[PDB]
Scaffold this active site. Structure first.
Site, PDB file in Angstrom:
ATOM      1  N   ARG A  66       0.826  -1.192   0.000  1.00 17.58           N
ATOM      2  CA  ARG A  66       0.000   0.000   0.000  1.00 17.58           C
ATOM      3  C   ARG A  66       0.871   1.256   0.000  1.00 17.58           C
ATOM      4  NH1 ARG A  66      -3.085  -1.578   3.719  1.00 17.58           N
ATOM      5  NH2 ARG A  66      -4.690  -2.349   2.286  1.00 17.58           N
ATOM      6  N   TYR A  70       0.502   4.696  -2.372  1.00 20.81           N
ATOM      7  CA  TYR A  70       0.438   6.054  -1.854  1.00 20.81           C
ATOM      8  C   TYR A  70       1.527   6.907  -2.499  1.00 20.81           C
ATOM      9  CZ  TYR A  70      -2.767   4.178   1.695  1.00 20.81           C
ATOM     10  OH  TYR A  70      -3.814   3.580   2.337  1.00 20.81           O
ATOM     11  N   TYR A  92     -12.122  11.961  -0.002  1.00 21.26           N
ATOM     12  CA  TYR A  92     -13.336  11.838   0.780  1.00 21.26           C
ATOM     13  C   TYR A  92     -12.995  12.135   2.239  1.00 21.26           C
ATOM     14  CZ  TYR A  92     -12.142   7.132   2.539  1.00 21.26           C
ATOM     15  OH  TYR A  92     -11.541   6.072   3.152  1.00 21.26           O
TER      16      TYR A  92
HETATM   17  C1  LIG Z   1      -7.854   5.887   4.755  1.00 18.53           C
HETATM   18  S1  LIG Z   1      -8.918   6.231   6.149  1.00 18.53           S
HETATM   19  C2  LIG Z   1      -9.981   7.532   5.461  1.00 18.53           C
HETATM   20  C3  LIG Z   1     -10.502   8.542   6.486  1.00 18.53           C
HETATM   21  C4  LIG Z   1     -11.077   9.820   5.859  1.00 18.53           C
HETATM   22  N1  LIG Z   1      -9.992  10.759   5.458  1.00 18.53           N
HETATM   23  C5  LIG Z   1     -11.999  10.539   6.855  1.00 18.53           C
HETATM   24  O1  LIG Z   1     -11.866  11.776   6.952  1.00 18.53           O
HETATM   25  O2  LIG Z   1     -12.830   9.848   7.479  1.00 18.53           O
HETATM   26  C6  LIG Z   1     -10.087   4.861   6.013  1.00 18.53           C
HETATM   27  C7  LIG Z   1     -10.791   4.601   7.325  1.00 18.53           C
HETATM   28  O3  LIG Z   1     -11.642   5.725   7.647  1.00 18.53           O
HETATM   29  C8  LIG Z   1     -12.811   5.264   8.286  1.00 18.53           C
HETATM   30  N2  LIG Z   1     -13.956   5.506   7.419  1.00 18.53           N
HETATM   31  C9  LIG Z   1     -13.955   5.762   6.070  1.00 18.53           C
HETATM   32  N3  LIG Z   1     -15.156   5.868   5.563  1.00 18.53           N
HETATM   33  C10 LIG Z   1     -16.003   5.632   6.635  1.00 18.53           C
HETATM   34  C11 LIG Z   1     -17.406   5.596   6.746  1.00 18.53           C
HETATM   35  N4  LIG Z   1     -18.230   5.793   5.721  1.00 18.53           N
HETATM   36  N5  LIG Z   1     -17.929   5.335   7.966  1.00 18.53           N
HETATM   37  C12 LIG Z   1     -17.091   5.120   8.987  1.00 18.53           C
HETATM   38  N6  LIG Z   1     -15.763   5.135   9.004  1.00 18.53           N
HETATM   39  C13 LIG Z   1     -15.273   5.397   7.783  1.00 18.53           C
HETATM   40  C14 LIG Z   1     -12.599   3.775   8.550  1.00 18.53           C
HETATM   41  O4  LIG Z   1     -11.943   3.573   9.782  1.00 18.53           O
HETATM   42  C15 LIG Z   1     -11.731   3.404   7.348  1.00 18.53           C
HETATM   43  O5  LIG Z   1     -11.011   2.189   7.510  1.00 18.53           O
END
Ligand SMILES: C[S@@+](CC[C@H](N)C(=O)[O-])C[C@H]1O[C@@H](n2cnc3c(N)ncnc32)[C@H](O)[C@@H]1O
Ligand SMILES: C[S@@+](CC[C@H](N)C(=O)[O-])C[C@H]1O[C@@H](n2cnc3c(N)ncnc32)[C@H](O)[C@@H]1O
Lengths: 259, 52, 262, 52
Positions: A66, A70, A92
């Site tokens: 990964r 990145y 996102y």
């Molecule tokens: C690479 S990080 C992305 C976080 C993103 N930048 C944010 O602001 O939430 C990925 C993690 O964010 C969290 N995440 C992302 N999408 C989510 C969602 N729809 N609901 C809950 N947690 C979410 C989870 O822990 C997931 O494994």
């Protein structure tokens, strides 16, 4: 050239900030990492000059670290900046929360003498507080990446709300798979049992990405985590197992008490 | 088709959001969503919607 | 009637979400708690039917429990809902982060059988990660209210980024004052010294509220905190005292070692 | 009126924001800010700005 990294929030179209939307509209080029095809379409209508960062993930069952994905994303972004483009990266959520690409790109851009900044957005945890009706300030809040919690020494405060991010890949040490195994989750359960009873209610949370969609708010005992259906987007919420106790030493120094 | 257009509008327009929450099916029909699409929404089948 | 609580973020005009702006626009009535007169004017132009919640704060040098102010705020909001109004509460930042008025109003509204919901917004913490170029996930993150940290047994993990909110009233138990004293902050310093050296660099952070304004990012040794100029809006960032170290116990259970980590 | 109108537009318009970043004084002058207003901005005195 220049770089601005913005977040689109989690919900389609409406959860981006007014200014962040404007940045996207006026960009020469946009590098995107969005939840789904609906958000992708929304973005392309806002600005047609989009490069989808998704392409840098392992494509055809390839084994790919990964970290390499990145790095390739960062290099793609910087190439646009270096070439002279007014570049926006639209990730996102919040572009700097559990997200290394924007921080890395900003660091590198600045090092190379380019203007680079991050605009905050609405993160998954921001959504969690609203959906569950929990204030992080009530008894405090702690966040860790689940794998980091396993591989490094972290001690949670069991009076707080504890968030384990990236739970679906907990303990997946290679950075080459998109899910973990039940065995690894069992090890996490045993680890957490240092502070949390096996029957302690935990919550698998997924913020909705579409306006017609309800969040996932699945309550289960910790012991059952290893059998649970987890998604890349799942976050694990572990509510307090312990009530706040009085800090008598400090209270006495302050000259006050429970009353 | 109409799915994306509808979801984008609904997501950023508070009047439409309020209308939708009052009567989901009527609002979806007014925006031309098919019975199949409406069924996917009401059963919470996000994968089906994506394919449609 | 109905209730929607939205956040306006910290920066004027631009940091509100698109949908949240729409909620304000279409509201019958808006109850506001905003940072300054610029944001107040911005709101009034969006929707002229505004009630400013600031009025419920102690106006004179009067002593008033902040809990009482919050109760009156919540009552004012609910009165509009009960009367039949499509009510929106517009709070700065995120309406549910280190904030009780929205959570309370939503709970009470639901109990009385009204539709009530909270829309997430951009909080001071969200601004901090962006302004300082710090990811909460890098080595973890803990947030506590400063006074709660003092009054109750909280145990920080010194590998994380630690945020103490409401640092300007740290230790002020009455909830009747706008600020604390040097003495209280010195007690906090001694408390923190359990985990953090006195020369540990900490950061007083204040997100900007205006587009022409730079954030406050003041770096100082922990020892100097009691002499610092703090404002109601200040958040204290305590960066890690220790680097991450390997959890050999769990690595052993996983059947791997450090060299195996991708 | 003018001060407030300017700040509101600057805060939400990314084109104006980037123009401002490139040349703060020119942009502020062009939007009718007084020397005293510009001084308050450049010295970072938010209290004086509010008074103005
Ligand atoms: C690479 S990080 C992305 C976080 C993103 N930048 C944010 O602001 O939430 C990925 C993690 O964010 C969290 N995440 C992302 N999408 C989510 C969602 N729809 N609901 C809950 N947690 C979410 C989870 O822990 C997931 O494994
Ligand atoms: C009652 S809480 C309100 C928090 C708000 N709901 C949010 O989302 O940030 C007040 C505390 O939030 C933090 N805060 C508020 N405004 C801030 C700013 N401009 N910069 C930094 N922290 C701020 C400080 O810790 C302050 O004491």
């Amino acid at each position: 050239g220049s770089l601005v990294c913005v977040g689109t929030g989690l919900q389609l179209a409406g959860q981006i900030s007014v200014l962040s939307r404007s940045y996207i509209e006026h960009a020469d080029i946009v590098f995107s990492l969005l939840p789904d095809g609906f958000s992708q379409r929304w973005l392309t209508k806002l600005n047609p000059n989009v490069i989808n960062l998704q392409q840098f993930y392992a494509q055809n069952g390839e084994v790919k670290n990964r970290r390499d994905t990145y790095e390739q994303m960062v290099n793609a972004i910087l190439d646009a900046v270096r070439a002279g483009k007014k570049t926006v990266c639209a990730l996102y959520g919040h572009p700097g929360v559990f997200a290394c690409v924007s921080h890395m790109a900003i660091t590198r851009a600045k090092a190379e003498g380019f203007s680079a900044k991050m605009e905050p957005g609405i993160s998954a945890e921001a959504c969690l507080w609203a959906d569950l009706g929990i204030d992080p300030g009530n008894s405090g809040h702690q966040s860790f990446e689940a794998s980091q919690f396993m591989f490094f020494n972290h001690v949670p405060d069991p009076t707080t709300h504890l968030l384990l991010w990236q739970i679906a890949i907990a303990g997946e040490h290679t950075l080459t798979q998109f899910h973990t195994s039940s065995d690894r989750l069992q090890i996490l359960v045993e680890q957490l049992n240092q502070w949390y009873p096996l029957d302690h209610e935990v919550v698998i949370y997924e913020a909705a990405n579409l306006p017609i969609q309800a969040p996932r708010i699945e309550r289960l005992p910790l012991a059952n985590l290893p059998q649970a259906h987890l998604m890349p987007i799942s976050t694990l919420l572990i509510p307090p197992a312990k009530k706040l106790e009085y800090n008598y030493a400090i209270l006495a120094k302050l000259g006050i008490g429970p009353e | 088709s109409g799915l994306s257009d509808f979801f984008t509008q609904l997501g950023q327009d508070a009047q439409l959001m309020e209308d939708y929450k009052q009567n989901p099916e009527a609002v979806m029909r007014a925006h031309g969503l098919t019975d199949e699409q409406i069924n996917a929404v009401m059963t919470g089948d996000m994968e089906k919607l994506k394919t449609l």
